[PDB]
Design an enzyme around this catalytic site. Structure first.
Site, mmCIF file in Angstrom:
data_model
loop_
_atom_site.group_PDB
_atom_site.id
_atom_site.type_symbol
_atom_site.label_atom_id
_atom_site.label_comp_id
_atom_site.label_asym_id
_atom_site.label_seq_id
_atom_site.Cartn_x
_atom_site.Cartn_y
_atom_site.Cartn_z
ATOM 1 N N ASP A 138 43.349 39.269 -24.271
ATOM 2 C CA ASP A 138 43.830 38.074 -24.249
ATOM 3 C C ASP A 138 42.653 37.319 -24.111
ATOM 4 O O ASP A 138 41.695 37.760 -22.941
ATOM 5 C CB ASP A 138 44.518 37.811 -22.749
ATOM 6 N N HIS A 196 45.268 37.812 -28.463
ATOM 7 C CA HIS A 196 46.279 36.214 -27.956
ATOM 8 C C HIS A 196 45.457 35.323 -27.572
ATOM 9 O O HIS A 196 44.112 35.507 -26.939
ATOM 10 C CB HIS A 196 47.179 36.725 -27.144
ATOM 11 N N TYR A 226 43.666 24.537 -7.398
ATOM 12 C CA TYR A 226 42.368 25.121 -7.320
ATOM 13 C C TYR A 226 42.263 26.616 -7.563
ATOM 14 O O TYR A 226 43.319 27.253 -7.553
ATOM 15 C CB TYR A 226 42.018 25.062 -5.583
ATOM 16 N N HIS A 284 55.633 26.152 -21.765
ATOM 17 C CA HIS A 284 55.368 25.403 -20.532
ATOM 18 C C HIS A 284 56.834 24.489 -20.288
ATOM 19 O O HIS A 284 56.834 23.857 -19.400
ATOM 20 C CB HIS A 284 54.122 24.577 -20.875
#
Ligand code: MET
Ligand SMILES: [Zn+2]
EC number: 2.1.1.14
Length: 755
Positions: free
Chosen positions: A604, A647, A521, A696
């Protein structure tokens, strides 16, 4: 008497009970029976809340333990083989698809739901897929309708419709040639059966969501609505209310002008101007559900204006055929404003969260019906006016400054090639310069000390600790020989709120939680008025990091579009105006950074694509212009020798838009799949770092891995333009994982530097 309608209610719970229970279940601390009991209690509580407020049309099947789209895939048996070979009960097959299964198999793909901040689990289909109703798993929409009925609450089941469900899906790995929508004739029987069962249970209406109608659809897709709905409608099923949200359906109006459905819902918050044309295709008997209370933002609705919209609808189709609705599901708004204890009460008066939007749809309904709700109207009018006249809303200094925006404020002093000459003299970076994206593994020690600063240690013990972490990371990067360093961002909780809290024009909640995906959340900041920057936000920590190394240190900023798109925006001025104010605010931060010696600066922008307008046309191209422009307003004031980095988390982000920024250096996610993309930048002089490895993940690539990857890039892209870096930051990776992987990346670049 005009009915009120709610399209879905957020299910996370007013105290986040859903998160607590699902995480406790997944961890093995709570039983599955505990989990299902807590779900039932939430659904009951939420149904009673809506009944209590007086809502007429109350949704069911809007509840989920993870994702509603995924719940439909379970229900219809769109369940890949790999997930089925483990003895797993339906609910744990669900969680496996949702979040993967580790035992001593990867999750299905997460995708943004339109231009909302919610993500759904992608429906995934193979040639082998057999659609059928999966009933030993209970039939969630039937079960949950029956449950509300035993409570004394008649509900309207909500299901995503057959065209949207297929069209938003994708072919599995083993069926790359399959067109999902070609599966329509196989899924329609299963929808029919489900609708029969709901009718038999006592459902008289079903809300059937077809939001792909707000998108640009091929003609051969638009024809499928007639096909799907002809087949579903009949005497043995409930009345269907075909529901659209988030955009404009008019270009697809031909596809729905002759459907046998009982009614339509349109989003008149995002697109009020579509009313006349969509109302015109309604046949005699069909109802029109007017979406006039925003399901995606937190502002108290203007009852006068909303009531006027409803009244335009009534005038076109008749009062007995109109319903007052939320524009979309309230899934995208926090549960309850009454949970906020800190907000200044004058601001709070301007807000309505999910619970309050229930009362709003009721009052508007009653008002157009002719009940006397004068006192609610006047109270609402006074709130609207207080906000419109507030000094918070309107800062003259900020308005003046907006009048200075032009191409020249958004252009660097000189073009890239001349800048490169000065940057080479200033930094003398080698070929294959190496760097990272910013964040490093978040030491448990530090995150403990964060929680401790939040009185058990004072500011300076806070300073000293932040500072030692920075030192560690800097020393670490020197040790492995990286060329352009970062500070690690230990001081930063969240890439948006960290800035928002330091900017004028923002407010923050304590409990304004909204589901992003599964049990994760977010609590977005709220833009309440004109944005400005009173003071340095990042300088202190960047200066410290640069003082302990002779390598160049990147300053680190989140861009303006991302701050806008991850906040609740104002609904009284455009996105563009907000982003430009935020660009000007960041421009002052960039100035301060540069003045203090921080002359390499990264901005970013991970949410750039998320805000892309849903259809092609003027709005989309305007967006791309103003998005690039607000980045340029932030970054364009610097000296030629100051190296600006941008980025991007999206790969296959629009090359033209990348070019439009004119950043000295661009880093991008690219550790995933097709080489023509790299070829897009070969005549473009500015430098690029195609992210070499998936952040990741956790697996260490070899040096030769890094090497084979560059030589694929260099067969398309010049080595003189090429940076070496990871996909994104390393906040979430482990230290030993990180140490070996970066050492490996550098030594590969060094070998290319030599050869
Ligand atoms: C998701 S883009 C944000 C990058 C940020 N500087 C990081 O490295 O964690
Ligand atoms: Zn990234």
């Amino acid at each position: 008497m005009v009915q009120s309608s709610v399209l879905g209610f957020p299910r996370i719970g007013g105290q986040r009970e859903l998160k607590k229970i699902t995480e406790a279940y997944w961890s093995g601390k709570a039983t599955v029976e505990e989990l299902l009991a807590k779900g039932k209690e939430l659904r009951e509580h939420n149904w009673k809340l809506q009944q209590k407020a007086g809502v007429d049309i109350i949704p069911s099947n809007d509840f989920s333990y993870y994702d509603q789209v995924l719940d439909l895939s379970l229900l219809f048996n769109a369940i890949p083989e790999r997930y089925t070979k483990f003895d797993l009960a339906p609910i744990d097959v669900l969680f496996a698809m949702g979040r993967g299964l580790q035992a001593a198999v990867t999750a299905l793909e997460m995708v943004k739901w339109f231009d909302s901040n919610y993500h759904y689990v992608r429906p995934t289909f193979s040639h082998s897929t057999e659609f059928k109703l999966n009933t030993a798993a209970g039939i969630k929409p039937v079960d949950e309708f029956n449950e509300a009925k035993a409570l004394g609450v008649q509900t309207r089941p909500v299901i995503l419709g057959p065209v949207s469900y297929l069209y938003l899906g994708k072919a599995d790995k083993d069926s790359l040639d399959l067109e999902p929508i070609s599966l329509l004739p196989k899924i329609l029987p299963v929808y029919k059966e489900l609708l029969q069962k709901l009718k038999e249970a006592g459902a008289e209406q079903v809300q059937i969501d077809e939001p792909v109608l707000v998108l640009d659809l091929p003609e051969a897709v638009q024809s499928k609505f007639k096909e799907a709905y002809d087949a579903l409608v009949g005497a043995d099923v409930p009345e269907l209310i075909l529901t659209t949200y988030f955009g404009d359906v008019r270009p697809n109006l031909k596809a729905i002008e002759n459907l046998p459905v009982a009614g339509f819902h349109f989003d008149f918050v995002r697109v009020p101007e579509q009313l006349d044309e969509v109302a015109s295709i309604l046949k005699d008997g069909q109802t029109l559900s007017a979406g006039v209370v925003d399901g995606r933002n937190i502002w108290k609705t203007d009852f006068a204006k909303a009531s006027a919209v409803v009244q335009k609808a009534i005038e076109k189709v008749g009062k007995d055929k109109v319903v007052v609705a939320t524009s979309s599901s309230l899934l995208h708004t926090p549960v309850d404003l009454e949970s906020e204890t800190k907000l200044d009460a004058v601001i709070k008066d301007w807000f309505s969260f999910a619970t309050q939007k229930l009362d709003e749809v009721v009052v508007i309904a009653k008002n157009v019906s002719g009940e006397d709700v004068s006192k609610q109207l006047e109270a609402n009018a006074a709130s609207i006016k207080a906000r419109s006249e507030s000094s918070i809303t309107n800062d003259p200094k900020v308005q003046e400054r907006l009048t200075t925006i032009n191409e020249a404020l958004a252009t660097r002093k000189a073009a890239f090639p001349e800048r490169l000459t000065e940057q080479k003299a200033k930094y003398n970076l080698p070929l294959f310069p190496t760097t990272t994206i910013g964040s490093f593994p978040q030491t448990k020690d530090i995150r403990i000390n964060r929680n401790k600063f939040a009185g058990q240690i004072t500011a300076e013990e806070y300073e000293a600790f932040i500072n030692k972490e920075i030192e560690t990371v800097v020393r670490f990067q020197e040790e492995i020989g990286l060329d352009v360093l970062v500070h690690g961002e230990p001081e930063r909780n969240d890439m948006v709120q960290y800035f928002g809290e330091q900017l004028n024009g923002f407010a923050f909640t304590t409990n304004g939680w909204v589901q992003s995906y599964g049990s994760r959340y977010v609590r977005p900041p709220i833009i309440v008025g004109d944005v400005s920057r009173p003071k340095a936000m990042t300088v202190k920590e960047s200066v410290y990091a640069q003082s302990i190394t002779s390598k160049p240190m990147k300053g680190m900023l989140t861009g303006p579009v991302t701050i806008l798109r991850w906040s609740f925006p104002r609904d009284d001025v455009s996105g563009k105006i907000q982003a430009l104010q935020l660009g000007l605010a960041l421009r002052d931060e960039v100035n301060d950074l540069e003045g203090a010696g921080i002359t390499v600066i990264q901005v970013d922008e991970p949410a750039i694509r998320e805000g892309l307008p849903l259809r092609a046309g003027k709005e989309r191209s305007d967006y791309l212009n103003w998005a690039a422009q607000s980045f340029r307003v932030a970054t364009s004031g610097v000296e030629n020798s100051t190296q600006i980095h941008s980025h991007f988390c999206y790969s296959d982000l629009d090359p033209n838009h990348i070019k439009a920024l004119d950043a000295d250096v661009v880093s991008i996610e690219f550790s995933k799949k097709d080489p023509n993309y790299i070829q897009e930048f070969s005549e473009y002089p500015n430098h690029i770092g195609l992210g070499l490895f998936d952040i990741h993940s956790p697996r260490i690539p070899s040096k030769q891995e890094f090497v084979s990857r560059i030589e694929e890039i260099l067969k398309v892209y010049p080595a003189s333009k090429f940076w070496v870096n990871p996909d994104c930051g390393l906040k979430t990776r482990g230290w030993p994982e990180v140490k070996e992987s970066l050492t490996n990346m550098v030594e590969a670049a060094k070998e290319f530097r030599a050869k």
